[PDB]
């Protein structure tokens, strides 16, 4: 039997990174698409169901969406990860499918060091025709370089980032002459990381806790870091001469 | 008591105007001068175009004229006469923003002039507005991850032919190159001699020409185009 002529149209998806948090930092296209959408997504963890994005979002005006939360496990087996990625990603799946519009809203840049990127991945894999498109945002290390007025990389340096620093990397961690290393999670290995640092000459240390927070902190003097109480929300880069 | 302007370096992002922050938008509204960047060979400058795209600017457009490639001493010059041009405004009172494609503080001329002018007035008040980069933005067009969990990102400003031999793309690394103009057929015989390896490949972000491919012998079979950029990914 011949399958007919029926259009249905599913809902467009969106992908919208929304920049460190301040809510001066989102794109036009992010506003836009924010109030182009009937649902928007966020973040949150197990422990509560506070989103900071949701709270960014609702915070820019005009938004007349239903947000609705997904919870991600930041436990170390890969199955379980992959069955929640799963799961979040058949709840988007289910409200796509009625012809709603989505957009799933990501702290940072929705493409670098993100959960959106997993959701985005399965959600294509299963649905090659899906219309999804993503927004690009402002990156927590730009805007570390731009709120401590210090250059990030410039001419022929090279740039480097290194996701999450396990405290097993210090003493094999390289810092080639003329380049920018970028480190995004310092919270509990900070202290064989300023170790390592310590024993390194000719480099310039640019530290930042809480990017477009009320309690920012920044500071290039690697004795005041070491002072300070561990913090989850803390980036820093490193530039060698 | 005679205050100063306020300065203002600001990112507007790879040229789509709706890749400006709002914070990029309200400083272009409020200021009453907006500098951007020429080349030594025409007057003409895209970030001001952007700029005026956005509407409600009602500041004054300057150009300001650099050329990152010449001897230290005609960069010397210029940037101590760009900064003088600066200062020349700031001194009447008038607030003023540097627009520069991109993200001000990543691969721009926009540090030179910071350097100098805080150097030249450590009391100025100064504030520098990130942008999207372009390499961002060419993942998020192709519907790529540029880098995600423990994945290390490289990004190499300038390619040169002499690197393909030299050059190593580690397992698990994403590397950006960005201009890889007229070095690009040894950059892919290079890649042609590695496995489990992506290459994403864009020319034209927001133009008529808008080409995005992922597809490695797509890319070796077109002509070379200055306004170009990939990343590599090695799994």
Redesign the interface.
């Given at each position: 039997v011949p399958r007919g002529s029926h259009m249905a149209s599913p809902g467009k998806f969106y992908?919208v990174?929304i920049?460190p948090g301040?809510?001066?930092?989102?794109?036009?296209?992010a506003?836009?698409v924010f109030r182009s959408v009937d649902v928007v997504f966020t973040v949150t963890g197990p422990n509560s169901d506070f989103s900071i994005s949701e709270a960014v979002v609702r915070s820019?005006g005009g938004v007349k969406a239903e947000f609705r939360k997904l919870v991600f496990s930041m436990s170390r087996d890969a199955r379980t990860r992959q069955e929640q990625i799963e799961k979040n990603t058949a709840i988007i799946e289910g409200v796509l499918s009625r012809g709603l519009d989505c957009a799933f809203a990501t702290l940072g840049?929705?493409?670098?060091?993100?959960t959106f990127?997993?959701i985005?991945?399965l959600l294509?894999s299963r649905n090659p025709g899906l219309h999804?498109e993503?927004?690009?945002?402002?990156?927590s290390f730009?805007?570390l370089?731009?709120?401590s007025?210090?250059?990030?990389?410039?001419?022929?340096?090279?740039?480097?980032?290194?996701?999450?620093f396990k405290p097993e990397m210090a003493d094999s961690l390289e810092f080639p002459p003329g380049t920018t290393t970028v480190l995004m999670k310092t919270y509990r290995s900070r202290a064989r990381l300023m170790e390592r640092i310590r024993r390194e000459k000719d480099i310039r240390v640019i530290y930042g806790e809480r990017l477009g927070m009320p309690d920012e902190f920044i500071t290039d003097d690697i004795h005041v870091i070491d002072a300070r109480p561990e913090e989850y929300l803390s980036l820093m880069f490193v530039k060698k001469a």
């Open positions: 992908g990174g920049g301040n809510p001066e930092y989102l794109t036009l296209k506003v836009n820019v840049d929705a493409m670098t060091y993100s990127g997993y985005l991945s294509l999804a993503v927004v690009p945002g402002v990156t730009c805007t370089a731009a709120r007025r210090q250059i990030l990389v410039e001419n022929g340096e090279r740039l480097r980032v290194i996701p999450a």
